[PDB]
Design an enzyme around this catalytic site. Structure first.
Site, PDB file in Angstrom:
ATOM      1  N   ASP E  43       0.829  -1.193   0.000  1.00 22.01           N
ATOM      2  CA  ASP E  43       0.000   0.000   0.000  1.00 22.01           C
ATOM      3  C   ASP E  43       0.872   1.255   0.000  1.00 22.01           C
ATOM      4  O   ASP E  43       2.064   1.220   0.315  1.00 22.01           O
ATOM      5  CB  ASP E  43      -0.929  -0.004   1.213  1.00 22.01           C
ATOM      6  CG  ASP E  43      -2.115   0.925   1.050  1.00 22.01           C
ATOM      7  OD1 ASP E  43      -2.115   1.745   0.108  1.00 22.01           O
ATOM      8  OD2 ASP E  43      -3.045   0.843   1.879  1.00 22.01           O
TER       9      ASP E  43
HETATM   10  C1  LIG Z   1      -0.950  12.821  17.800  1.00 19.82           C
HETATM   11  C2  LIG Z   1      -1.714  13.847  16.962  1.00 19.82           C
HETATM   12  C3  LIG Z   1      -3.150  13.441  16.557  1.00 19.82           C
HETATM   13  C4  LIG Z   1      -3.433  13.486  15.032  1.00 19.82           C
HETATM   14  C5  LIG Z   1      -4.885  13.134  14.588  1.00 19.82           C
HETATM   15  C6  LIG Z   1      -5.019  12.381  13.228  1.00 19.82           C
HETATM   16  C7  LIG Z   1      -6.442  11.829  12.875  1.00 19.82           C
HETATM   17  C8  LIG Z   1      -6.486  10.424  12.183  1.00 19.82           C
HETATM   18  C9  LIG Z   1      -7.872   9.953  11.636  1.00 19.82           C
HETATM   19  C10 LIG Z   1      -8.217  10.414  10.185  1.00 19.82           C
HETATM   20  C11 LIG Z   1      -9.210   9.513   9.403  1.00 19.82           C
HETATM   21  C12 LIG Z   1      -8.869   9.273   7.921  1.00 19.82           C
HETATM   22  O1  LIG Z   1      -8.443   8.215   7.535  1.00 19.82           O
HETATM   23  S1  LIG Z   1      -9.134  10.654   6.717  1.00 19.82           S
HETATM   24  C13 LIG Z   1     -10.380  10.242   5.371  1.00 19.82           C
HETATM   25  C14 LIG Z   1      -9.956  10.791   3.988  1.00 19.82           C
HETATM   26  N1  LIG Z   1     -10.531  10.110   2.817  1.00 19.82           N
HETATM   27  C15 LIG Z   1     -10.031   8.927   2.274  1.00 19.82           C
HETATM   28  O2  LIG Z   1      -9.050   8.412   2.809  1.00 19.82           O
HETATM   29  C16 LIG Z   1     -10.703   8.310   1.049  1.00 19.82           C
HETATM   30  C17 LIG Z   1      -9.765   7.534   0.085  1.00 19.82           C
HETATM   31  N2  LIG Z   1      -8.451   7.261   0.684  1.00 19.82           N
HETATM   32  C18 LIG Z   1      -7.243   7.485   0.000  1.00 19.82           C
HETATM   33  O3  LIG Z   1      -7.356   7.924  -1.143  1.00 19.82           O
HETATM   34  C19 LIG Z   1      -5.861   7.184   0.682  1.00 19.82           C
HETATM   35  O4  LIG Z   1      -4.905   7.681  -0.201  1.00 19.82           O
HETATM   36  C20 LIG Z   1      -5.583   5.671   0.916  1.00 19.82           C
HETATM   37  C21 LIG Z   1      -6.536   4.822   0.085  1.00 19.82           C
HETATM   38  C22 LIG Z   1      -5.776   5.395   2.398  1.00 19.82           C
HETATM   39  C23 LIG Z   1      -4.075   5.277   0.503  1.00 19.82           C
HETATM   40  O5  LIG Z   1      -3.807   5.702  -0.722  1.00 19.82           O
HETATM   41  P1  LIG Z   1      -2.431   4.995  -1.717  1.00 19.82           P
HETATM   42  O6  LIG Z   1      -3.052   3.672  -2.078  1.00 19.82           O
HETATM   43  O7  LIG Z   1      -2.314   6.015  -2.823  1.00 19.82           O
HETATM   44  O8  LIG Z   1      -1.280   4.954  -0.733  1.00 19.82           O
END
Ligand SMILES: CCCCCCCCCCCC(=O)SCCNC(=O)CCNC(=O)[C@H](O)C(C)(C)COP(=O)(O)O
Ligand SMILES: CCCCCCCCCCCCCCCCCC(=O)OC[C@H](COP(=O)([O-])OCC(O)COP(=O)([O-])OC[C@@H](COC(=O)CCCCCCCCCCCCCCCCC)OC(=O)CCCCCCCCCCCCCCCCC)OC(=O)CCCCCCCCCCCCCCCCC
Ligand SMILES: CCCCCCCCCCCCCCCCCC(=O)OC[C@H](COP(=O)([O-])OCC(O)COP(=O)([O-])OC[C@@H](COC(=O)CCCCCCCCCCCCCCCCC)OC(=O)CCCCCCCCCCCCCCCCC)OC(=O)CCCCCCCCCCCCCCCCC
Ligand SMILES: CCCCCCCCCCCCCCCCC[C@@H](O)O[C@H](CO[C@H](O)CCCCCCCCCCCCCCC)COP(=O)(O)OCC[N+](C)(C)C
Ligand SMILES: CCCCCCCCCCCCCCCCC[C@@H](O)O[C@H](CO[C@H](O)CCCCCCCCCCCCCCC)COP(=O)(O)OCC[N+](C)(C)C
Ligand SMILES: CCCCCCCC/C=C/CCCCCCCC(=O)OC[C@H](COP(=O)(O)OCCN)OC(=O)CCCCCCC/C=C/CCCCCCCC
Lengths: 459, 178, 53, 175, 88, 56, 70
Positions: E43
């Site tokens: 990935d």
């Molecule tokens: C310590 C400090 C705290 C920080 C807080 C952080 C909060 C974390 C929680 C956020 C929730 C989420 O996932 S945020 C939700 C955002 N939307 C999506 O993820 C839809 C499609 N996903 C993608 O396109 C990605 O790229 C992916 C497929 C994963 C890989 O891609 P590759 O295949 O190109 O590597």
């Protein structure tokens, strides 16, 4: 006194009868010899003065200024030798002639037993400076700068001539010795108030006072290196010398009269030191630092106490040398970069280490680091002001801090950091420039061993 | 730092950058290795839950909301590598980085030492003089009309050609010259 | 020039003043006189104007 | 030393205690100062003797300048410039002498404060009162003249002070 | 300092070491030029975790723009060699 | 070579000639301010057996 | 190890030349002056204060202590 004046006059035929490629060598050597001759005047007495004749006298206020004026000419010649290389022999000879005439006028101005002779020479110094500024200047605003410099001076000084002739009509003499021994109090009258204003404003404009300081940035930025040197080192001190000479007649009117000027200078030093913090130009920054120092000198002269006078003399000498050195450094940068803006050429310590050392020493001596004579004058004036009023120190305190800031700012913007990638015409510093900086800086560190030599007649 | 930037950042670039920042700040929070590993795997698992989501509006809702959470718990004093733009040795050796053209100003008595170096430098100067004259024409012909759209340079395409605008990229002083 | 300025003769009369003060204090302490007088000039030779107000 | 007069700058007899070694352990201070003497003081002393015999082989003297007394500003006409010049020079010389007197008294005070050490507050009351008196005298003569001071200004200040004193005395007597 | 002058061989050895301790990849199937997206079925998050491991291994961190377009161990070694000015 | 370097180096002599001339002129101007010589109240002095003027 | 790399730095020849020239001239004049001052102090100097004999008037340069000042 003619043992100094006649060689200075002979400098002109020697220059004009010189071989086309030996003018600089002949001029520098004989200027240094004349400076050596000027050193004899330093051995002053605790008594009245060194009255050579009816026309000229010497004083321990006049002697350091005369020595500095003589010493400045070889430095100005060495600084001007660079940018006048592609110039015809006649015009180089004219430039040297103008410098020699300026020295002669200053030398006769500083001795000047009589006030009308002093005024005549004091205004005679104006023509060579104006011609140097408006002729061998690079930018198109040199004409406007020359107009400002001429007209501020003349507007200030025209009432002074009327006041002087009136004073001679009433008293009967304009001689300094007679005036000092026959001084009488001035009654607090409107006519006396205007006479005081006419006597003071002419020297106030050349310091210059914070209200009337506009001509100075223009004149300093637009003048060549020799013009900037002579303006910052000697021409600004003419106002202080004139005030110290003419203030004797003014009392007891000075106490009431001094407040507008004292407030203007105490706030203007802060204003100009703060202006220095936000500047895009080296020459303008040095000019504003000069304005701040001369505002402090104005405060010292207006307080009119012995410590004030000693501090003012020491600060004038120290500022002259330091500002001449700073302008020389800025010109060395400009002759390579041709921009004269701080933020363009950066990180010059990596490329020019010895020149960076010179920059550090100049910025430290502008910062008034002890036991330099800069801080000697600084501290004497500050103590006198504190005795005058315990609140002045606060303003003085701010000034000191602000001064240090911009000084190191000028040291950090141009010398520290990363060198600009594109500039590639930064050649190694020449022996001439290093000698210029050494000859600027060594007299300060020699004088700090013998401060009494520059502390004036009230020592 | 080497590659040219893009006109924008896509959604996946933003989520990857947020993942990087969050994982670095969690490592800063979790000093010990086992605790960091456990919490990083827990965070990775939480992150992967919304991976197959197809709604763009929902996708916009995701991560940006997470960014606010990241900003709330961002460890005000994170770990920074010593040479990084926030590190304690970020620009320690920039004062030792002297340009190459300065060697053109050396005194002949100094150039008497190191003669082979200056001979190789002369060969480099000859190569640069020829290659730049070729590169000017190559870039003039290859550039799109109306000015470039992206600050990326094309490679060399002939045999004797060199990469356009190569002199100041190849002749970097060093990372640690002294 | 620095050497010349360093060895300039005492035309400011500093050692002269020190010796004068030394001899003067030596004499005054012995006589029992109270050091330096408050008046710079002797009052007997100053003629004040009588007020009669 | 004969180079300076003992009466002008008085010093106590400087009584010092005797070494009383209560233990048989050889202290390092005595051996250290003896080796210092042997390695430093003797060569310096012989160099001084050589320099002194070199000086005695050539001998010359210089004489302190003496000045006559000239009529002061009170014996000067209102516009007669010659006597005013002479009086001004005399007044300036006297001002320098008074400055040196105050310097001598301040030197006495500083020397006492350092020498008597911890009991300086009691054993230097004489010098403190001496300096207070001389400072009072000096301040009266020249404190407010300021820059461009002159004998005429000092005389005017003295006259103002003495009219004030005469009025105060007359009012107190006639109170 | 007293830091040994690391070479391309050492860089590549340490890269392959870190990749073989990555249990998501069986060690005998990977190679110097083996791709990350297709040759190993990893990935993008796995790739950025590989970037994490590289940054923690070599003591310096790669900018995100350059990191997100690194898909082979060989080009990663080349980039890090360019950053560290490696001769051989 | 004499009579050749002179035509090129003659200019150097001018500053020192001006200095000695100025010294002479200073003495000559001094000679005109002797009205109070050996007449000051501070320095009235009886002339030496072979002295004519206290200062020149 | 034979990994000696070339150090790019600005030409320090001119700075060293200027420093050497300045030191050379300053010493060229100061060393004779220092030697002369030491000889004058050791051999001739340090006159001592005396009293003016009666009937004798001293010259102007006889009121100073250091021989160079006189
Ligand atoms: C310590 C400090 C705290 C920080 C807080 C952080 C909060 C974390 C929680 C956020 C929730 C989420 O996932 S945020 C939700 C955002 N939307 C999506 O993820 C839809 C499609 N996903 C993608 O396109 C990605 O790229 C992916 C497929 C994963 C890989 O891609 P590759 O295949 O190109 O590597
Ligand atoms: C301290 C005692 C010293 C005794 C020995 C005598 C020393 C004489 C030195 C005279 C000054 C040097 C000449 C001025 C310009 C520099 C000349 C030069 O070109 O150098 C090239 C030369 C070789 O350079 P390079 O390697 O080729 O070039 C390298 C790069 O350029 C890179 O260059 P860099 O980065 O190496 O820069 C050089 C170096 C030094 O270079 C400088 O910055 C020179 C200027 C420093 C002072 C700045 C002005 C501040 C006001 C001080 C006024 C003091 C006047 C005293 C009388 C002076 C008489 C001349 O930088 C500094 O060290 C900064 C020093 C800041 C000092 C801050 C404290 C000042 C007050 C200290 C107390 C002084 C009085 C004490 C009284 C009570 C006790 C007795 O380097 C030196 O010679 C360095 C000199 C050593 C540093 C001296 C610093 C203190 C000097 C104070 C004045 C003298 C005090 C005497 C009594 C002491 C007791
Ligand atoms: C950047 C550079 C810029 C330079 C610009 C040009 C220079 C500008 C300034 C020039 C001004 C010169 C000047 O005014 O001189 C002043 C002054 C002149 O003295 P004076 O007023 O004529 O003499 C006073 C008395 O009337 C006479 O006293 P006396 O006759 O009893 O004394 C003996 C005599 C001679 O005494 C001795 O020879 C012996 C003394 C020590 C004896 C020790 C024992 C030896 C015997 C024992 C060992 C052998 C025998 C036993 C063997 C067996 C051993 C086991 O004294 C001397 O000869 C002193 C010589 C001074 C030489 C000054 C040179 C100035 C040169 C100016 C130009 C410099 C340009 C730069 C180049 C300079 C050259 C590097 O000379 C000094 O300043 C000496 C300073 C000594 C300092 C001592 C330590 C003080 C430490 C305080 C600070 C503590 C905290 C740190
Ligand atoms: C622009 C940059 C700076 C330039 C230089 C500025 C400095 C020059 C300013 C001059 C300072 C003040 C001038 C006169 C001061 C006199 C004292 C007066 O202010 O106090 C009262 C005076 O009251 C009023 O001030 C009367 C005068 C009012 C008219 C003056 C104009 C006021 C503002 C104008 C400022 C413009 C200056 C620049 C002109 C171009 C005291 O009342 P009184 O006891 O009765 O008068 C005492 C004086 N006697 C004894 C001679 C009679
Ligand atoms: C490069 C690294 C360092 C190498 C060198 C190491 C050696 C360091 C020594 C240099 C300075 C260290 C301090 C040592 C000081 C000793 C000398 C000092 O004592 O002499 C001073 C003497 O210096 C002079 O007084 C000051 C110099 C004069 C300055 C005039 C400037 C020169 C003219 C050039 C043109 C002027 C331009 C500016 C116009 C105003 C003070 O003398 P003074 O205590 O009093 O009495 C002397 C003895 N008397 C009583 C017999 C008279
Ligand atoms: C910015 C500088 C400060 C300016 C402050 C005031 C500005 C406003 C004044 C504008 C000009 C006014 C011109 C007329 C003023 C009249 C003053 C006057 O005549 O006094 C003269 C007075 C007494 O007159 P008598 O009749 O002879 O006495 C017999 C009876 N007692 O005698 C004198 O002192 C003569 C001295 C000349 C006065 C100077 C006149 C000019 C104003 C003073 C200078 C201030 C302005 C300086 C300009 C600054 C530019 C750098």
């Amino acid at each position: 006194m003619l043992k100094i004046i006649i060689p200075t006059t002979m400098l002109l035929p020697m220059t004009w009868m010189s071989k086309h490629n030996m003018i600089w060598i002949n001029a520098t050597v004989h200027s240094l010899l004349i400076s050596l001759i000027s050193l004899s005047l330093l051995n002053q007495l605790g008594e009245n003065s060194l009255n050579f004749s009816l026309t000229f006298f010497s004083d321990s206020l006049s002697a350091p200024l005369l020595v500095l004026t003589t010493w400045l000419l070889p430095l100005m010649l060495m600084a001007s030798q660079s940018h006048l290389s592609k110039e015809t022999t006649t015009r180089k000879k004219l430039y040297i002639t103008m410098l020699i005439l300026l020295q002669l006028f200053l030398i006769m101005t500083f001795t000047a037993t009589e006030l009308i002779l002093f005024y005549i020479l004091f205004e005679a110094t104006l023509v060579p400076t104006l011609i140097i500024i408006t002729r061998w200047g690079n930018q198109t605003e040199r004409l406007n700068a020359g107009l400002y410099f001429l007209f501020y001076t003349l507007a200030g000084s025209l009432p002074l001539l009327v006041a002087l002739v009136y004073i001679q009509n009433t008293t009967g003499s304009l001689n300094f010795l007679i005036i000092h021994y026959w001084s009488h109090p001035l009654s607090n009258s409107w006519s006396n108030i205007f006479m005081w204003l006419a006597c003071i404003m002419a020297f106030m404009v050349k310091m210059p006072l914070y209200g009337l300081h506009l001509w100075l940035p223009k004149a300093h930025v637009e003048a060549p290196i020799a013009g900037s040197m002579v303006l910052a080192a000697v021409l600004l001190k003419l106002g202080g010398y004139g005030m110290m000479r003419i203030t004797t007649i003014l009392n007891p009117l000075t106490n009431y009269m001094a407040y507008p000027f004292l407030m203007l200078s105490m706030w203007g030093m802060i204003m100009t030191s703060s202006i220095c913090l936000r500047q895009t130009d080296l020459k303008s920054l040095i000019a504003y630092s000069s304005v701040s120092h001369m505002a402090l000198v104005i405060v010292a002269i207006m307080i009119q106490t012995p410590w004030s006078f000693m501090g003012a003399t020491a600060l004038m000498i120290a500022h002259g040398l330091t500002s001449s050195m700073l302008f020389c450094l800025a010109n060395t940068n400009y002759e390579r970069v041709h921009s004269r803006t701080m933020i363009l050429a950066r990180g010059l310590q990596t490329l020019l280490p010895l020149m960076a050392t010179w920059w550090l020493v100049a910025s430290l001596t502008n910062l008034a680091l002890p036991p330099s004579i800069n801080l000697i004058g600084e501290l004497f004036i500050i103590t006198a002001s504190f005795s005058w009023s315990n609140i002045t120190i606060i303003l003085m305190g701010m000034n000191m801090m602000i001064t240090a800031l911009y000084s190191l700012y000028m040291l950090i913007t141009t010398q520290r950091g990363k060198y600009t990638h594109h500039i590639n015409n930064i050649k190694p510093s020449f022996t001439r420039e290093n000698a210029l900086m050494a000859l600027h800086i060594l007299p300060l560190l020699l004088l700090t061993l013998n401060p009494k030599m520059i502390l004036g007649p009230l020592y | 730092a080497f590659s040219a930037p893009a006109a924008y950042l896509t959604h996946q670039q933003k989520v990857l950058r947020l993942y990087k920042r969050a994982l670095r700040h969690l490592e800063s929070w979790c000093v010990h290795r086992d605790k960091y590993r456990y919490f990083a795997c827990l965070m990775r698992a939480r992150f992967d839950e919304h991976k197959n989501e197809k709604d763009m509006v929902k996708a916009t809702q995701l991560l940006r909301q997470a960014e606010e959470e990241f900003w709330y718990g961002q460890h005000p004093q994170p770990y920074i590598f010593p040479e990084s733009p926030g590190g304690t040795s970020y620009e320690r050796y920039e004062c030792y980085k002297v340009p190459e053209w300065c060697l053109d100003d050396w005194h002949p008595s100094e150039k008497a030492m190191y003669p082979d170096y200056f001979a190789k430098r002369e060969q480099w100067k000859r190569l640069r003089r020829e290659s730049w004259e070729r590169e000017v024409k190559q870039l003039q012909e290859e550039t799109p009309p109306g000015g470039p759209r992206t600050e990326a340079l094309p490679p060399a395409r002939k045999e004797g050609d060199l990469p356009p605008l190569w002199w100041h990229i190849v002749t970097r002083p060093r990372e640690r010259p002294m | 020039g620095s050497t010349f300025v360093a060895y300039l003769p005492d035309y400011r009369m500093q050692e002269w003043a020190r010796r004068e003060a030394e001899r003067l204090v030596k004499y005054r302490e012995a006589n029992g006189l109270p050091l330096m007088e408050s008046n710079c000039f002797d009052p007997n030779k100053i003629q004040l104007p009588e007020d009669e107000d | 030393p004969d180079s300076w007069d003992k009466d002008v700058y008085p010093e106590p007899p400087r009584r010092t205690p005797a070494p009383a070694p209560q233990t048989s352990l050889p202290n390092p201070v005595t051996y250290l100062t003896k080796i210092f003497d042997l390695l430093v003081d003797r060569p310096v002393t012989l160099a001084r003797e050589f320099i002194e015999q070199q000086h005695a082989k050539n001998r010359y003297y210089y004489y302190h300048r003496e000045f006559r007394r000239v009529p002061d500003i009170t014996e000067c006409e209102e516009k007669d410039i010659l006597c005013m010049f002479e009086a001004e020079m005399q007044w300036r010389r006297d001002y320098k002498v008074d400055q040196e007197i105050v310097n001598i008294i301040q030197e006495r005070l500083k020397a006492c404060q350092q020498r008597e050490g911890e009991s300086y507050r009691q054993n230097c009351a004489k010098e403190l009162e001496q300096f207070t008196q001389v400072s009072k005298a000096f301040q009266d003569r020249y404190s407010d003249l300021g820059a461009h001071y002159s004998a005429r200004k000092c005389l005017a200040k003295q006259k103002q002070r003495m009219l004030a004193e005469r009025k105060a005395a007359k009012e107190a007597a006639a109170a | 300092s007293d830091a040994p002058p690391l070479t391309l061989e050492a860089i590549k050895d340490r890269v392959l070491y870190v990749l073989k301790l990555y249990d998501k990849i069986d060690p005998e199937k990977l190679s110097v030029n083996s791709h990350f997206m297709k040759d190993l079925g990893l990935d993008s998050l796995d790739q950025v975790e590989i970037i994490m491991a590289m940054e923690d291994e070599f003591g310096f961190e790669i900018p995100d723009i350059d990191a997100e377009k690194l898909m082979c161990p060989q080009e990663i070694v080349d980039y890090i060699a360019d950053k560290k000015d490696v001769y051989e | 070579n004499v009579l050749q370097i002179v035509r090129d180096h003659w200019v150097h002599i001018l500053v020192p000639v001006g200095f000695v001339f100025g010294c002479y002129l200073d003495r000559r101007s001094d000679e005109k301010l002797t009205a109070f010589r050996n007449k000051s109240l501070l320095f009235k002095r009886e002339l030496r057996p072979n002295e004519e003027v206290t200062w020149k | 190890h034979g990994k000696r790399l070339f150090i790019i730095k600005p030409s320090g020849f001119y700075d060293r030349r200027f420093l050497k020239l300045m030191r050379f001239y300053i010493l060229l004049t100061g060393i004779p002056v220092a030697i002369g001052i030491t000889l004058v102090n050791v051999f001739i100097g340090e006159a001592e204060l005396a009293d003016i004999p009666e009937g004798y008037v001293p010259e102007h340069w006889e009121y100073f202590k250091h021989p160079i000042s006189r």
